[PDB]
Amino acid sequence: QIMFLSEPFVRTALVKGSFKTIVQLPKYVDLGEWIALNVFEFFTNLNQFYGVVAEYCTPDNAGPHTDYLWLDANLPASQYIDLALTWINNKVNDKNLFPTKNGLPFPQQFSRDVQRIMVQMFRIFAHIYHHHFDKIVHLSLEAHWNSFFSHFISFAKEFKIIDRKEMAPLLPLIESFEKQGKI
Amino acid sequence: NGTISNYMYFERRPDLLTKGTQDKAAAVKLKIENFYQSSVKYAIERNERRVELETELTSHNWSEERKSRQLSSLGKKESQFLRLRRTRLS
Ligand SMILES: [Zn+2]
């Protein structure tokens, strides 16, 4: 059960530009503060984006051929997303990694966990695009969801937080977006 | 196969969409449009403040090390702005 986002629904509104201005690190701004704000922003909007399609994500876990798994060391699509969303919320509000006081800096773990937080958001991007994207089209949301992914992917390339390999399930879409998905 | 274009038609029906999902979808529309319109607005002002300070500093024939300290002083206050905007309970 895979669905086709390569049809004329490769229409992205809200993307007059290529996202270069709002993704590029602002000059003289601390690099940690820039990543920390955008990751929180991406999680907040992705959690809300998943909220509209959460009603129709019941058992049927991931996309075709590539099936993600939270079960190994020590689930259906609704289960692993709900746990991942809650987990990112705990880490994103964790003052250890995301301090809100002015003097406190980001720890050494910060760079690695940001890499861990981004990939889960991409994996949550996968199930919705692969299995719950045709309700996005019903709700006329393909304009906002396409631009949200292109912004997210442009953010992944710019700071190299996500490996090229990891984008394999949505790689044809990213290639199709080359004009809006950053070069 | 090859670079051939594909077009598809959809029922486009928001019917039988459990009411709340229809209302939730309208909320993300407003939030996303407000987010990206403000996101470009934040970045534009951020660049406008820096460039205006840079042209202002070369106007006084300052040493390059003095300009960088002033420009880095802005970036610190710019970084303070990002931490402040990140602090949220919404
Ligand atoms: Zn599902």
The gist of it:
Chain A is built from seven helices and no strands. Chain A is mainly α and 183 residues long. Chain B has 90 residues and is mainly alpha-helical.
Write up this protein.
The complex is a heterodimer of chains A (183) and B (90). Chain A is mainly alpha-helical. Chain A has a single domain, classed as MOB kinase activator (Butyryl-CoA Dehydrogenase, subunit A, domain 3, Up-down Bundle). Chain A has helices at 20-23, 31-53, 77-92, 110-131, 133-138, 142-158, 171-176. In chain A, α2 packs parallel to α4 (110-131). The longest helix of chain A is centred in the first third of the chain and has 23 residues, at 31-53. Chain B is mainly α and 90 residues long. Chain B has one domain (1-90). Chain B has helices at residues 20-58, 64-86. The chains are: A mainly alpha (183), B mainly alpha (90). Chain A binds chain B through residues 4, 6-9, 14, 17, 21-22, 26-30, 33-34, 36-37, 40-41, 44-45, 48-49, 51-53, 55-56, 98-100, 102, 134-135, 137-141, 144, 147-148, 151, and chain B through 6-8, 10-14, 17-18, 20-22, 24-25, 27-29, 31-33, 35-36, 39-40, 42-44, 46-47, 50, 71-72, 74-76, 78-80, 82-83, 85-88, 90. Residues 57, 60, 77, 127, 131-132 of chain A line the site of zinc ion. Zinc ion binds next to α4 of chain A.
The biggest beta sheet of chain B, please? none
- Provide the succession of SSEs of chain B: HH
Which oligomeric state applies? heterodimer
CATH architecture of chain A: Up-down Bundle
* CATH homolog superfamily of chain A: MOB kinase activator
The backbone outline of chain B, from C-alpha atoms, is elongated
E-strand count of chain B: 0
- Integer tally of domains of chain A: 1
Q: What radius of gyration of chain B results from the CA coordinates?
A: 23 Å
Radius of gyration of chain A: 16 Å
Number of domains of chain B: 1
| Alpha plus pi helix count of chain B | 2
Structural class of chain A: mainly alpha
Q: What ions, cofactors and ligands are bound?
A: zinc ion
Q: What percentage of the residues of chain A does DSSP assign to strands (E)?
A: under 5%
SS summary, helix count of chain A: 7
Please outline the major beta sheet of chain A: none
